[PDB]
Design an enzyme around this catalytic site. Structure first.
Site, PDB file in Angstrom:
ATOM      1  CG  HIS A  12      -1.994  -1.156   1.027  1.00 32.80           C
ATOM      2  ND1 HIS A  12      -2.825  -1.291  -0.072  1.00 32.80           N
ATOM      3  CD2 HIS A  12      -2.235  -2.234   1.822  1.00 32.80           C
ATOM      4  CE1 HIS A  12      -3.528  -2.415   0.043  1.00 32.80           C
ATOM      5  NE2 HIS A  12      -3.197  -3.000   1.181  1.00 32.80           N
ATOM      6  CE  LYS A  41      -4.115  -7.348  -2.578  1.00 34.70           C
ATOM      7  NZ  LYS A  41      -4.292  -5.929  -2.217  1.00 34.70           N
ATOM      8  CG  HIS A 119      -7.312  -4.510   6.435  1.00 32.15           C
ATOM      9  ND1 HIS A 119      -7.608  -5.360   5.371  1.00 32.15           N
ATOM     10  CD2 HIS A 119      -8.448  -3.779   6.648  1.00 32.15           C
ATOM     11  CE1 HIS A 119      -8.843  -5.133   4.949  1.00 32.15           C
ATOM     12  NE2 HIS A 119      -9.376  -4.190   5.718  1.00 32.15           N
ATOM     13  CG  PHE A 120      -6.012   0.479   2.098  1.00 35.32           C
ATOM     14  CD1 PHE A 120      -7.209   0.593   1.385  1.00 35.32           C
ATOM     15  CD2 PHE A 120      -5.220   1.603   2.289  1.00 35.32           C
ATOM     16  CE1 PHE A 120      -7.581   1.818   0.853  1.00 35.32           C
ATOM     17  CE2 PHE A 120      -5.581   2.820   1.782  1.00 35.32           C
ATOM     18  CZ  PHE A 120      -6.771   2.936   1.055  1.00 35.32           C
ATOM     19  CG  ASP A 121     -11.823  -1.518   6.321  1.00 33.04           C
ATOM     20  OD1 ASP A 121     -11.711  -2.762   6.234  1.00 33.04           O
ATOM     21  OD2 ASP A 121     -12.893  -0.964   6.670  1.00 33.04           O
TER      22      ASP A 121
HETATM   23 CL   LIG Z   1      -6.728  -2.295  -1.289  1.00 36.44          CL
END
Ligand SMILES: [Cl-]
Ligand SMILES: [Cl-]
Length: 124
Positions: A12, A41, A119-121
């Site tokens: 990210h 992905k 985590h990217f939410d």
């Molecule tokens: Cl993402």
């Protein structure tokens, strides 16, 4: 052999540019960050801010995560981001992505000691 924090950075963080260049940014970054290895992905967001600015979000506005957890935080300011999503023409191992550059608040899940993004939410 990757910490949750380190995986978050790799997937990210893209602090070396202010904003996605070109339509090919996502193809290049998804490959270079090793997100196209055994599969494409499908969706991934890169943040164009310093790692310190992103880390700082873990002390900003506490919000629910999509999944109902309570360790998510929403950036007080918008941040330059690029969303990468596969196109219909994408067939593993020739992955193909749409690049969408935007300024949005980011939402991340944080954890650990130090208390950092894992985590990217979402972006809003
Ligand atoms: Cl993402
Ligand atoms: Cl780490």
């Amino acid at each position: 052999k990757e910490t949750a924090a380190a995986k978050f950075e790799r997937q990210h963080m893209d602090s070396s540019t202010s904003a996605a260049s070109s339509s090919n940014y996502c193809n290049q970054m998804m490959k270079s960050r090793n997100l196209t290895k055994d599969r494409c992905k499908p969706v991934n967001t890169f943040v164009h801010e310093s790692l310190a600015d992103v880390q700082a979000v873990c002390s900003q506005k506490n919000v629910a995560c999509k999944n109902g957890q309570t360790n998510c935080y929403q950036s007080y300011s918008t941040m330059s981001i690029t969303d990468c999503r596969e196109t219909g023409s994408s067939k593993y191992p020739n992955c193909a992505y749409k690049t969408t550059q935007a300024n949005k608040h980011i939402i991340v899940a944080c954890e650990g000691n130090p208390y950092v993004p894992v985590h990217f939410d979402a972006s809003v």
